[PDB]
Amino acid sequence: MTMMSGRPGRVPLQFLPNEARSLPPPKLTDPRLVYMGFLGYCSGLIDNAIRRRPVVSAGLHRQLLYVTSFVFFGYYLLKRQDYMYALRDHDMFAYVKSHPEDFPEKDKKTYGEILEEFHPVR
Amino acid sequence: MNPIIYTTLIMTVMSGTMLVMISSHWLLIWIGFEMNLLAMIPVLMKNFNPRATEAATKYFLTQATASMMLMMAIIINLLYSGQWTITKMFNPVAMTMMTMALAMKLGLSPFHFWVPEVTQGISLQAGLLLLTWQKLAPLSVLCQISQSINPNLMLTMAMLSILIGGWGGLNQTQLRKIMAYSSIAHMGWMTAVLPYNTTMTILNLLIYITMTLAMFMLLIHSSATTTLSLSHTWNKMPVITSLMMVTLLSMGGLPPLSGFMPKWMIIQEMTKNESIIMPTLMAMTALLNLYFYMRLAYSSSLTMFPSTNNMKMKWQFEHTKQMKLLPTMIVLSTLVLPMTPALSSLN
Amino acid sequence: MNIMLTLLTNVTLASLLVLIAFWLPQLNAYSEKTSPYECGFDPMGSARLPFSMKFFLVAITFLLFDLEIALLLPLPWASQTNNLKTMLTMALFLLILLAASLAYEWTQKGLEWAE
Amino acid sequence: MPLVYMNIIMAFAIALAGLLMYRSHLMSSLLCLEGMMLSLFIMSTLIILNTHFTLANMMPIILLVFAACEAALGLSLLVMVSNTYGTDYVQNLNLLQC
Amino acid sequence: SDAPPLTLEAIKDRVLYVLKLYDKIDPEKLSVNSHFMKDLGLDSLDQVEIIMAMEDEFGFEIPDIDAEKLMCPQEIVDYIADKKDVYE
Amino acid sequence: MTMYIAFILSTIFVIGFVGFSSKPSPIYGGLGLIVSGGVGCGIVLNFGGSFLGLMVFLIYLGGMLVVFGYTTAMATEMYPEVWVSNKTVFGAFVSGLMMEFCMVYYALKEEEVEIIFKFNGLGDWVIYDTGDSGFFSEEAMGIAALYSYGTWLVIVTGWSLLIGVVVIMEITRGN
Amino acid sequence: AKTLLHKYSDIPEGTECHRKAYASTSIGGATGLIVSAYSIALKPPASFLEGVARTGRYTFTSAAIGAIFGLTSCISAQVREKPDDPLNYFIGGCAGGLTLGARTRSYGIGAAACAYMGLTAALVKMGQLEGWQVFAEPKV
Amino acid sequence: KFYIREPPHGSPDWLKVGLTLGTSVFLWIYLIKQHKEDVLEYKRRNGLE
Amino acid sequence: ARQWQPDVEWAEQFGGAVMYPTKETAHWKPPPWNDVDPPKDTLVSNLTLNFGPQ
Numbered sequence A: 001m002t003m004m005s006g007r008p009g010r011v012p013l014q015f016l017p018n019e020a021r022s023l024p025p026p027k028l029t030d031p032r033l034v035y036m037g038f039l040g041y042c043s044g045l046i047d048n049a050i051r052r053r054p055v056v057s058a059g060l061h062r063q064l065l066y067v068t069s070f071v072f073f074g075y076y077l078l079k080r081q082d083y084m085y086a087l088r089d090h091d092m093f094a095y096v097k098s099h100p101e102d103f104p105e106k107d108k109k110t111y112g113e114i115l116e117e118f119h120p121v122r
Numbered sequence B: 001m002n003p004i005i006y007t008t009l010i011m012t013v014m015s016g017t018m019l020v021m022i023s024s025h026w027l028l029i030w031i032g033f034e035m036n037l038l039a040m041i042p043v044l045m046k047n048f049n050p051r052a053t054e055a056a057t058k059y060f061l062t063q064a065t066a067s068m069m070l071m072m073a074i075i076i077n078l079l080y081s082g083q084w085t086i087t088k089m090f091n092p093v094a095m096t097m098m099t100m101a102l103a104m105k106l107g108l109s110p111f112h113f114w115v116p117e118v119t120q121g122i123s124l125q126a127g128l129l130l131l132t133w134q135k136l137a138p139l140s141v142l143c144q145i146s147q148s149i150n151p152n153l154m155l156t157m158a159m160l161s162i163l164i165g166g167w168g169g170l171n172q173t174q175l176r177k178i179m180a181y182s183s184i185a186h187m188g189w190m191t192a193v194l195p196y197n198t199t200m201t202i203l204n205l206l207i208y209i210t211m212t213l214a215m216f217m218l219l220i221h222s223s224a225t226t227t228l229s230l231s232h233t234w235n236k237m238p239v240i241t242s243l244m245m246v247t248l249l250s251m252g253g254l255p256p257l258s259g260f261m262p263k264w265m266i267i268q269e270m271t272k273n274e275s276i277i278m279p280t281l282m283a284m285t286a287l288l289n290l291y292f293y294m295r296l297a298y299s300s301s302l303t304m305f306p307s308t309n310n311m312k313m314k315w316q317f318e319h320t321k322q323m324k325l326l327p328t329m330i331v332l333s334t335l336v337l338p339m340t341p342a343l344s345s346l347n
Numbered sequence C: 001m002n003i004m005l006t007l008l009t010n011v012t013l014a015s016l017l018v019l020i021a022f023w024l025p026q027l028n029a030y031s032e033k034t035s036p037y038e039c040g041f042d043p044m045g046s047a048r049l050p051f052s053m054k055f056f057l058v059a060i061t062f063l064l065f066d067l068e069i070a071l072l073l074p075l076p077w078a079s080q081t082n083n084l085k086t087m088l089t090m091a092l093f094l095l096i097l098l099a100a101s102l103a104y105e106w107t108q109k110g111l112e113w114a115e
Numbered sequence D: 001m002p003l004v005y006m007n008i009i010m011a012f013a014i015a016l017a018g019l020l021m022y023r024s025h026l027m028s029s030l031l032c033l034e035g036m037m038l039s040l041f042i043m044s045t046l047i048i049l050n051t052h053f054t055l056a057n058m059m060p061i062i063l064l065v066f067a068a069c070e071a072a073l074g075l076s077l078l079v080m081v082s083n084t085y086g087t088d089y090v091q092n093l094n095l096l097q098c
Numbered sequence E: 001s002d003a004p005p006l007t008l009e010a011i012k013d014r015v016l017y018v019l020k021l022y023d024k025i026d027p028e029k030l031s032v033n034s035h036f037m038k039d040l041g042l043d044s045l046d047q048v049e050i051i052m053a054m055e056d057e058f059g060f061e062i063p064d065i066d067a068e069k070l071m072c073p074q075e076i077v078d079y080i081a082d083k084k085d086v087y088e
Numbered sequence F: 001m002t003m004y005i006a007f008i009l010s011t012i013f014v015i016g017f018v019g020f021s022s023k024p025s026p027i028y029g030g031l032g033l034i035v036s037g038g039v040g041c042g043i044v045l046n047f048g049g050s051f052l053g054l055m056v057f058l059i060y061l062g063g064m065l066v067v068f069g070y071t072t073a074m075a076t077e078m079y080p081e082v083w084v085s086n087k088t089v090f091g092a093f094v095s096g097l098m099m100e101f102c103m104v105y106y107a108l109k110e111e112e113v114e115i116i117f118k119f120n121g122l123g124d125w126v127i128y129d130t131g132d133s134g135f136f137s138e139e140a141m142g143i144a145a146l147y148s149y150g151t152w153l154v155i156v157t158g159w160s161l162l163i164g165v166v167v168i169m170e171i172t173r174g175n
Numbered sequence G: 001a002k003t004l005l006h007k008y009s010d011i012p013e014g015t016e017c018h019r020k021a022y023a024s025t026s027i028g029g030a031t032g033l034i035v036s037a038y039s040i041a042l043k044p045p046a047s048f049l050e051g052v053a054r055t056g057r058y059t060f061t062s063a064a065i066g067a068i069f070g071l072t073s074c075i076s077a078q079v080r081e082k083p084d085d086p087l088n089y090f091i092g093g094c095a096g097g098l099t100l101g102a103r104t105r106s107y108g109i110g111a112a113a114c115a116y117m118g119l120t121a122a123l124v125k126m127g128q129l130e131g132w133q134v135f136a137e138p139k140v
Numbered sequence H: 001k002f003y004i005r006e007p008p009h010g011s012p013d014w015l016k017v018g019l020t021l022g023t024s025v026f027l028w029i030y031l032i033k034q035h036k037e038d039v040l041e042y043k044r045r046n047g048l049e
Numbered sequence I: 001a002r003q004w005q006p007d008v009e010w011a012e013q014f015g016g017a018v019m020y021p022t023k024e025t026a027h028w029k030p031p032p033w034n035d036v037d038p039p040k041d042t043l044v045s046n047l048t049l050n051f052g053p054q
């Protein structure tokens, strides 16, 4: 079952609709971006170790490129993920607002009027 | 074989898959399957020997039968509704035949016999291609018709695939057959959640493809096709064996590794329906795959097996060819669990 | 109906000729007379033994080249379309592709018979 | 459906069954594959003629083309198997197990 | 599994059966120690036929030397056992 | 009920299919497939599809000639089998004939759902067209539209045929 | 098919034990036939009569197990006057397991089958009572 | 010391090193610019400032 | 005094074509080191023909 495959107004291969520009972009110090940079640094270290080079010192340009590439991809990945979650919430709220019969707000009862069974522990 | 011809055949395989993935007409989808098979047959025979010839013959027979049933299901659907568009598949008999044909193409149990045999009969590069790229087209078609799918048949075949993958993998000393049974079990996991959520199918497919690529590239790096030949790799490249051990742990599904994420999300999705018993059995069965991954880890990384004298000559030389994407594949196979909410971008 | 009658008539005439050929003359069959002919000496092996095909590769190419004939036969009707530029481009595309396949097999010694 | 549709579908089922049960010769199974292709051609042509779908009159030609490709592929594989064993018996393709 | 682990006894029964299947040897007079040349009154050509019968029965060829010196069933049984490395 | 010509042709089609599916010998199987191709040409002709019937007959004649040569080269034995030379082949042939006859009787005397749907018969004349127009053959126009509408189909088909030539050369190379 | 399943499940629990046993025997026979078909396909029996013997052996084993399970389950349900109690299904499952053990002439197989079939049948009864779904329809 | 060329010499491959560093710097400045324009556009659309 | 490590006898358990061998699969052979089986001498007999005297 595909929930969002055919939502009206969806452009086939866009990856970032113009509507997404109305959302605050992720901060450059976002911990998820830092974790992506950590992944890139780990990839650089593993690249050094597999090629039988000094793991920490062998190629600084290669390690920098690894970290930069992972951060660069992660930024747009996070933007798209946040856009999808915003879309989900927007649709949920619109549907609840347009179908009041299926989401009734029934009367609130205080705990002084609700009869709860007591189960002794003994 | 000429490198130009090899590149042309690879592009024809990928062109058939892309034609399957972008078409709206059933005839074009069938044509994509035919083109993919026609280009794939010679790639399996690139290193010519009787075992490769036998593997190619078995693959051709299985896939040609599957495509014949596919075309018959399309024609029945056209007969009962003059529609060529890939949609809800207005006829139930046609849908049953379509499901069986796609299952035959994927290698889901009961039709799973060909996969171990073809994988063992070809080279590690051909096995990499067969077990990674060749799953895309049938899975895409299954995703596009998921609404009209009958849960009872698909779930039966998925559970059978998980069971048979575990049981068959328990008995293997050849690495290619182990990979094939692992592939069968992962296909079962992929198709179990398909009637409920195709995003989970895509996520599981991507994670499995990453782990499989990492495993096959590690096996090509250390030229081992048997357990005993892999038991020598510690005395030549210990880092390779350590990375292989961690990747094998990830394949097993143990947290906090990335392998655990698809199983976790599929279990959650199935419990969002009622569906309680099936995920429990699926996890209990995946314990078998974990067992034989752990046995491989015991043989190759956690203990040291005896070596031979001539390994000293190998110590003096380096690996000439280098796989540029192997470190990224290993990292994605292992350390990706904290980025789980990013799966929302898949739908 | 007329073509079915014609087929029936021709097959009946041939069958009647065979029947007359086999029932009119005097038959004197005995084992030497009916034995296989090999120029007066008995054959060594069987005629049902495998017979090698030196032109096997050309035979497979005939299967593929035969289907392009089915693609080219509707061309007389295709010349009546309004967009003659698209049709003429596609007819030449198919024939150029068919000449390229012949050129490839020719240069790779695919037309030479096995020895 | 009319009787002819059931007859063509029965022919397809018989050819499929024929392919599924192997005797000794590989070539017989290839013939069964070609028979399935012919049955599909006939069925699709009848359906397209009955509904007067003009642009669909060209699909069976495409089907025949890819049937020819499939048959050529099978024949090449048979040539290789026979060159290896001197016989096209499916019993000889038992080097790889499950 | 493959064929059962052939023993000396079965070898002897097969050899004796083949020998009594030979139309020039009377069954009751034949023993495992009978000598073909003297006891059975068999000539050199006859012996060659017996060795060929053994070859057919046990599925392996005996050279001209080797086979020539086997003059009674016990030597044939011993030769077959030694060739097949059968100890029981 | 009109002369039952289409029903007879389809029955002979099924009979030839049973003939080659019993797998007596490749030489005999090719003969059965040739007979099936002929009756299928007839069946399609009786529906207005002259071009398609003639084309499929020609194609299968060429294919069976190649198959005959290949059978003589690689699929022979001392005693080739016919439909009465072997209990397995004869049993399969008789079983197919009896299944066809049972299905025909079952659907002809009753009106029953075999597997997919039901059928009462009446001959395939009923669903015909009574269409009165044209100086052209609609099938011919549809097939000729391959060069103006089916550009994508022409591209993929030509590419696949060229690739098939390359593929057979690669497969039969050996080494 | 589900026709046999409905034929078994339509009859109330502690009523008409003979009909329930007949339906269970039919279900077991169908299962045994399918098992023997797969076994013959994947493991050829080298002779037609041997294949007939293997089919008969498997089918009779399965049919006997089903008959015993149904008979003792219904008998216990009607004797105790306690339908909708999983213990009846547990007793039937253990009886079927002991039948299998007698059929293969093995004590360990008999004991293991008694335990496992009893547990599985009790679980099936609990699932019928509480509405547990083996193949849930998509809901979300 | 080595018996053969060992093609990577004592000096690094300057073309590859320069290309790698240039790619890294280009990607970094592109990301900074993109984030700045994204912030500006978000602030404009919702009318914060 | 030192940690136990696998020896030849331990290592030979994984050297067969299969784990858990049975009577049927005890005769299965592991594949060759390179995936090349030895070529069979399936000699194809040439056709013998009498060219004459007639």
Ligand SMILES: CCCCCCCCCCCCCCCCCC(=O)OC[C@H](COP(=O)([O-])OCC(O)COP(=O)([O-])OC[C@@H](COC(=O)CCCCCCCCCCCCCCCCC)OC(=O)CCCCCCCCCCCCCCCCC)OC(=O)CCCCCCCCCCCCCCCCC
Pocket (backbone or CB within 6 Å): A042, A045, A046, A049, A053, A054, A055, A056, B238, B239, B242, B243, B245, B246, B256, B257, B301, B302, B334, B335
């Ligand atoms: C959760 C929280 C966060 C945790 C994150 C996850 C864990 C950490 C990240 C993981 C990946 C990172 C490293 C990847 C490359 C490592 C590969 C490697 O071989 O390393 C060797 C390398 C040594 O090589 P060398 O120095 O060139 O010379 C020695 C020779 O090479 C001698 O080498 P040799 O090859 O000759 O020696 C042979 C040896 C060589 O074999 C190995 O070295 C094994 C390494 C495998 C890498 C792990 C696989 C991929 C990552 C998955 C990890 C999963 C974690 C989740 C939990 C599951 C546990 C597995 O093999 C064996 O001896 C066999 C022993 C069998 C044991 C089996 C266990 C292996 C798996 C254990 C993995 C545990 C995690 C990583 C451990 C640390 C590794 C360095 O190690 C290093 O020196 C690098 C490590 C330190 C780098 C980080 C330091 C950062 C800079 C300092 C400043 C910090 C900034 C702070 C900011 C604030 C300002 C002050």
Ligand SMILES: CCCCCCCCCCCCCCCCCC(=O)OC[C@H](COP(=O)([O-])OCC(O)COP(=O)([O-])OC[C@@H](COC(=O)CCCCCCCCCCCCCCCCC)OC(=O)CCCCCCCCCCCCCCCCC)OC(=O)CCCCCCCCCCCCCCCCC
Pocket (backbone or CB within 6 Å): G105, G106, G107, G108, G109, G111, G114, G115
């Ligand atoms: C966490 C803490 C610890 C927990 C875990 C540890 C504890 C639990 C596990 C350990 C014990 C469990 C093992 C169960 C039995 C294993 C059988 C076995 O291994 O088979 C392979 C093994 C291999 O045999 P084979 O290769 O097939 O053939 C060679 C034979 O050995 C050659 O055989 P043979 O010629 O020597 O003679 C055999 C023959 C005759 O055997 C003899 O020759 C000597 C006579 C011994 C028979 C004993 C029966 C009469 C004595 C019973 C007295 C009352 C019982 C105690 C309760 C008192 C209540 C106040 O036996 C039979 O014919 C069996 C017929 C049935 C009668 C016995 C079964 C009675 C069921 C018990 C009812 C309990 C219900 C609950 C009650 C609640 C109130 C407490 O079989 C045997 O050799 C043993 C045969 C005897 C087994 C039956 C004994 C039953 C023991 C009590 C079972 C209760 C535990 C399970 C409860 C859950 C079930 C739902």
Ligand SMILES: CCCCCCCCCCCCCCCCC[C@@H](O)O[C@H](CO[C@H](O)CCCCCCCCCCCCCCC)COP(=O)(O)OCC[N+](C)(C)C
Pocket (backbone or CB within 6 Å): A005, A011, A012, A013, A014, A015, B203, B206, B207, B210, B258, B332, B333, B336, B339, B340, B341, B342, B343, B345, B346, B347
């Ligand atoms: C094991 C780790 C998995 C990693 C997988 C590979 C990661 C690197 C691959 C880079 C992806 C490049 C693609 C982006 C370029 C533009 C293409 C874009 O237009 O595609 C869009 C699609 O976007 C892509 O799907 C997003 C790809 C991002 C995948 C990453 C998510 C992995 C899950 C969380 C794990 C953490 C990942 C960390 C990465 C380092 C089109 O949307 P649409 O045509 O309408 O959808 C078609 C499918 N539908 C309709 C059936 C739904």
Ligand SMILES: CCCCCCCC/C=C\CCCCCCCC(=O)O[C@H](COC(=O)CCCCCCC/C=C/CCCCCCCC)COP(=O)(O)OCCN
Pocket (backbone or CB within 6 Å): B274, B276, B277, B280, G123, G130, G131, G132, G133
């Ligand atoms: C090495 C030893 C470790 C062994 C531990 C294994 C025992 C674990 C206990 C059983 C786990 C399965 C329970 C499933 C998770 C519960 C979630 C739940 O609440 O689901 C129930 C449903 O509950 C179930 O379906 C559970 C059925 C059991 C299926 C699997 C059986 C597993 C084995 C059973 C016996 C063993 C358990 C005890 C073993 C003790 C330790 C040996 C509610 O579903 P609904 O359908 O929505 O309810 C109302 C609508 N009908």
Ligand SMILES: CCCCCCCCCCCC(=O)SCCNC(=O)CCNC(=O)[C@H](O)C(C)(C)COP(=O)(O)O
Pocket (backbone or CB within 6 Å): E043, E044, E045
């Ligand atoms: C189907 C019809 C075809 C038939 C045609 C076959 C052609 C025949 C070819 C003839 C070849 C010879 O003459 S070969 C020469 C034969 N003669 C000798 O060797 C001289 C010494 N004679 C002896 O040793 C004994 O008399 C002896 C009988 C040998 C027993 O041998 P033992 O004492 O060691 O048991």
